[PDB]
Amino acid sequence: MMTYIVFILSIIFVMGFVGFSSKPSPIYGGLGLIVSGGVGCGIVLNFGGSFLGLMVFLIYLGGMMVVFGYTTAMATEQYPEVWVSNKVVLGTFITGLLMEFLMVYYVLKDKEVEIVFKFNGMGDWVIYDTGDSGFFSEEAMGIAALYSYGTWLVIVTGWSLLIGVVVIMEITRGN
Amino acid sequence: AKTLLHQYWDIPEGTECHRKTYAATSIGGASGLVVSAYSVALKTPTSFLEGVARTGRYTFTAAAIGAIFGLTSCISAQVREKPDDPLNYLIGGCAGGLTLGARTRSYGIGAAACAYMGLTAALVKMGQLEGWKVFAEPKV
Amino acid sequence: PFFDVQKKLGVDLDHWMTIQSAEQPHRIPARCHAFEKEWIECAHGIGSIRAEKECKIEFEDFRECLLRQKTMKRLNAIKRQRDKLIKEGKYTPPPHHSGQEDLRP
Amino acid sequence: VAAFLKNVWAKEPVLVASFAIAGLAVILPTLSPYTKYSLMINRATPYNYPVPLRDDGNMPDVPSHPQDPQGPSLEWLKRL
Amino acid sequence: MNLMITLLTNFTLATLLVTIAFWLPQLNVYSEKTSPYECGFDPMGSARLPFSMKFFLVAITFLLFDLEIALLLPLPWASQTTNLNTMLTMALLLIFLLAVSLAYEWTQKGLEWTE
Amino acid sequence: MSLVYMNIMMAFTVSLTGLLMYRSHLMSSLLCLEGMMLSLFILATLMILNSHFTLASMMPIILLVFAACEAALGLSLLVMVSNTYGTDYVQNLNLLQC
Amino acid sequence: PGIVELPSLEDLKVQEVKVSSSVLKAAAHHYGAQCDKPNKEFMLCRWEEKDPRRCLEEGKLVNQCALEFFRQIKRHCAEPFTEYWTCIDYSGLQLFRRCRKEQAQFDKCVLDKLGWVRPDLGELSKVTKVKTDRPLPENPYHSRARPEPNPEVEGDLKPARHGSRLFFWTM
Amino acid sequence: MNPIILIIILMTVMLGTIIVMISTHWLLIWIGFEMNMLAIIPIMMKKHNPRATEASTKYFLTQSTASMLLMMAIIINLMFSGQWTVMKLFNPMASMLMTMALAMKLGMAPFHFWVPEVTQGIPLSSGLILLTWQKLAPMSVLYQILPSINLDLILTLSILSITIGGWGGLNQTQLRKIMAYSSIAHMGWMTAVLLYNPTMTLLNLIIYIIMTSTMFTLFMANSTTTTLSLSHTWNKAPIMTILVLITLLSMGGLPPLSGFMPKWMIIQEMTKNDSIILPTLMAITALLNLYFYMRLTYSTALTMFPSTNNMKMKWQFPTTKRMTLLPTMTVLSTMLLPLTPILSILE
Amino acid sequence: MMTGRQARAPLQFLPDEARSLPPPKLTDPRLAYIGFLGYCSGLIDNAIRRRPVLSAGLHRQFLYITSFVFVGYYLLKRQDYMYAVRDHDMFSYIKSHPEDFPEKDKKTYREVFEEFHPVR
Amino acid sequence: QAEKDRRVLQMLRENLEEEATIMKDVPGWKVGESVFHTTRWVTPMMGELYGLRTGEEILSSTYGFIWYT
Ligand SMILES: CCCCCCCCCCCCCCCCCC(=O)OC[C@H](COP(=O)([O-])OCC[N+](C)(C)C)OC(=O)CCCCCCCCCCCCCCCCC
Ligand SMILES: CCCCCCCCCCCCCCCCCC(=O)OC[C@H](COP(=O)(O)OCCN)OC(=O)CCCCCCCCCCCCCCCCC
């Protein structure tokens, strides 16, 4: 069953999304989002985008670390809930996992499912291309074309980031 | 909710009372379910039992109104031999208004609901007869 | 309102990333470059109302190239029939489909 | 401006060094004559296949063989 | 194929060194050894209290700066493009905007710690 | 379509219904926002890498940048809240009801 | 739709160049110089037809010419080419700069015995012209007839009849 | 706030709205929306009081959810179309998600909950900037995707917004909540006629912007926040009472004022397409907006409410505020009916 | 509506076809009404700042009515151009498709039949 | 390029000849029917080639490069 490797990684992806979207406590939500980011970078690395996966992994690890510092600082409780300390959190986690595995079982039986779009049941390895790409990877040249072509995108993004820095300075002032 | 209205409207008037009453009951139950869902969303009940009691009360009230309206309209259409006549729908709307007054345990609400829902049901039958459009497909 | 500043001043801002048939780096073609080129050349200047029913064949072929729904359906049917014949024991796989196949080079 | 430069070099030399490096990196590529060398070095690297053209009958600039004297040569890159 | 094998091997070698460290020796657990350590005296309050941070502004600045320098990471590959003047101008503009944002943070006393 | 598309869309819907029902904590909603952003990023790059649209590879990473352009902003909208009240509960944000 | 047309297994049968990748890389430049015309004709046909089923004979000619090239190498300069491709094949990255002495021996032997000259830097990447007799495909994309465009606007812009004609307004 | 930083932030807001208006790429639309939200957040945090923090938090959460839905619909359209041209969409689910996102961005009911609370928790300058300028980009995006919106969904949203705004405007004494509910009702009025002829939508947008700006600027000049100070304004300057009376009579859709300009012609576009029930219901519901406008005029100008003793000192100090373009804006909002065919320039 | 018409040459206030139309006269009643709007704006500007409304700032009122007349004249030019475009497009489409707009006979009242409903 | 062209044509012909043997009793089936309305050559998809082969060749082909060290 090694041909469904991306499908298994996506199953772990939705599992982690169910794990942190039930909102037990932001520490374990951060752990679930770290796991989800890892399997997501694995998925996009399996599709060939190694640079994009490594970049999103690094960015979300840094963001989740700053988040963890914030929740240790500010959003804390005397008795944090791991997953089973609250009935509603454990309940919604259980139904999320149950719905995910029900969808897995249904798509693994007749190889077809209808949830609002229509989806197949075969592994994604069919939709790959059969030819080679020469002496370059397409994603690397595509992101490297940001400076040679996307001047407007670079300008508006740099202005947005500078304005964001100014906004962060202005909001947390107090007077 | 498109299939429920189409299921209610393709049955001939004054022919089968039970299927029309069941379709109207389903329409009323769907509307009451929407109303009770919004009620328990915006105004949080104090307990789960109170919330499910309110949901059941709203759904039962709307289902009773719809069932009595459909039964009275079909009975009037069979008794008068006038299937394409809005007065049967007016009678059914007033019967539903009396049902709403009985469920709310008041008389003035029953009379006002009779009048306004009878006018609304007569207007609905009028629009179905004349082919009026409420959400008009743009053509010009 | 859509104040079309870009064609008024002749300044290209985001017309190069709009479609996959544009000037790509190192002339790298998309997997459905021909279908999108045919659909764009069919529906150029005739309006969307006419293009929704006059160039529907090219757009349907392009949508089939994008998502491969019918190819997946055909492959699923073939695989299901093959597995059913294997299960009934009425079919034997050919030697070139089992591994000992001796490809061209 | 000599007094300000001496004061800021005595107080914070790191910012002075950073600004000097930044100023050189900004104003230097517009002065050096070797940027066009980078331009044709990057343009002379064959990523894609040189797809041939059909011989209609009047093409004097393109050769029929790669060893023909006509065509863009890179003896300058070998020399540099 | 090899990367998950290496990951599983290292994970197995790590996780085997605790079950060896757990089930091997002689254990003696009472309700005085496993108390939280606060230099011989029992602590005041819990360790789950709000730990009021000071460098929140620099944390948000790092949140922006990590990805705003991650935009600068394809600059090696961007040296291989035919259009070079535009790439050089855009890269210099990006790092100049980074420097302007850092200087604005520095001048407005944004890097200093609160209280 | 395929299968991984279905799984990523299911993850997006899971994070959406996680976001829309709050649990008296702002950081959890911010984590849900980051999760939906991650799911959108993954779906976009999956489609782009499948369809060989190379010039759109500038799209997702740039997209990821604007994630912080709200996400870090959300943290800056929390500290004043955590200076107004001792905690960050969403039930304390009901002064604008009159 | 229509049934996809595929050539039979007898049509694809050809004696392939059954050598390793390092063997091809070691004699890449002389193969590019000597057998240039049939490869150029085949790749022009490939770029002009957009169909592998309509370029089979040119691929057969390319295989025949490459096999003749390797046969001509094998008759005269077997052992220096053997040493050169072995030295290329040893390296993991198949670097050209690690095997300069065996390379110089190989082109010296093949220039003295066969009169073959290695091209200089950037010569093999040149774009050339090809004399071919096959007709151009008048429609290679298999496009159907394009729809007729909408008529354009022409004529003098006369003033509006009785103004705006909007309720009681006269202009 | 430093004036340089304020000018830079306002220019960033304008640049974001312009980027949404003039771009031909969906990613640029989303980038402009994000820049607009990021640069419009600190305008509401101008005075640094807690109510600004609640208003900013609620606005940020709603706008972030709307932006997520917009990007999901953009990605689905990319999947089903393989391009980025800002035009009609090729998936009904993407059209539904974009309509929901733009309804949340416009504050249209049943996504109207944040509008009165955000409007009440922020000053009058940020409130005017929000309720006038921030309602330009989503209307342009709705203008661009005209052959894609489901008719039933947008019409249900319009009638729901009109009814909910008309019902909600009755039970308010704060002026900002009244303006927010009026904005919701006008939002429903503009999106009711969008699929038939968007020139009427642009006309209604221009008229609504002019009247809302006039009312907000009069509120600046009188320095009023509640109904009681607006009543008290008759002692300081009766000309302001005359101006707010004629303006509130204009916004009630009463001829021969310019507020009868959009609505009437909106009806003129619904009867040509054989829809007679909906404009009648919409006018009957706009009678409620006219009702609380009449209540405001009764409190402010037509009756002489009691004042205090300290206002005597305010008789010795004339107004020195920068009432920018106020007479021109009042004249435009009141006496623009006989120039009705001017709207032909909006085609 | 005419958006495709404003597709080849966008962001033009008055195209090259707008100059073949007669410009509005300086004594246009709409232009006089817009000048009166400017005069009313000047009166309100004098009134809201506690100035004598008929004497204070005659230059201000003159600039008010001048700017109003300027903008109103250009807007009226654009409106006339747009209405001419509408009429021209309608007549061109009527001429281009004769089968979709067939002529109808004009029956005299001696042939047509009208039902009579008495009032009594 | 010539070797790849002959290889993919051989694989497509081999998959076509064994499709008729597998599907002969099914009703309404057409052997070798295209899914595109045009007769232009399209690039074969990985599912069209390796659809009737063992999993080792699948993992060597569509995942061999990415998983290679
Ligand atoms: C002051 C209090 C009392 C006020 C009473 C006012 C009048 C009462 C009736 C008004 C009905 C609404 C206007 C109808 C105009 C019809 C014009 C027309 O062409 O009709 C033919 C058109 C015909 O449709 P069509 O023209 O689209 O279709 C083509 C024609 N056929 C049908 C042959 C294919 O009629 C309609 O479209 C429907 C008309 C009935 C509308 C019912 C909904 C409104 C109900 C009344 C609400 C009144 C206000 C209540 C609140 C008051 C304040 C508290
Ligand atoms: C509950 C807490 C957690 C408990 C479990 C912890 C497990 C270990 C966690 C630490 C390791 C995390 C690894 C995350 C992914 C890293 C990807 C990587 O290392 O990629 C390297 C390399 C990229 O190189 P590339 O350019 O693709 O080369 C191809 C051309 N030769 O890639 C390659 O060359 C490709 C090699 C094969 C790749 C297969 C696809 C990815 C496999 C991912 C496995 C699962 C990762 C889970 C991470 C969880 C993190 C919390």
Ligand SMILES: CCCCCCCCCCCCCCCCCC(=O)OC[C@H](COP(=O)(O)OCCN)OC(=O)CCCCCCCCCCCCCCCCC
């Ligand atoms: C155009 C050139 C390129 C410009 C863009 C690229 C820049 C690259 C480097 C980026 C630097 C980022 C950070 C800059 C911060 C500057 C503002 C600042 O913090 O000034 C404070 C400092 C005095 O220190 P103090 O106030 O005590 O600081 C608090 C704790 N130390 O104040 C100072 O020490 C004075 C700082 C300003 C004066 C510096 C003068 C340097 C001169 C170098 C040689 C000539 C270079 C000519 C080029 C033009 C320079 C303007």
Ligand SMILES: CCCCCCCCCCCCCCCCCC(=O)OC[C@H](COP(=O)(O)OCCN)OC(=O)CCCCCCCCCCCCCCCCC
């Ligand atoms: C189809 C698409 C059509 C698009 C048309 C676009 C037209 C141009 C853009 C119009 C949109 C609104 C622009 C202005 C937004 C609000 C600006 C604002 O609030 O400025 C604040 C400023 C404060 O002044 P002050 O009293 O000194 O300060 C108090 C302390 N905070 O000042 C004020 O509070 C006073 C008000 C200043 C601005 C008033 C004039 C501009 C806005 C109304 C429009 C006037 C008519 C011109 C445009 C017609 C078409 C809309």
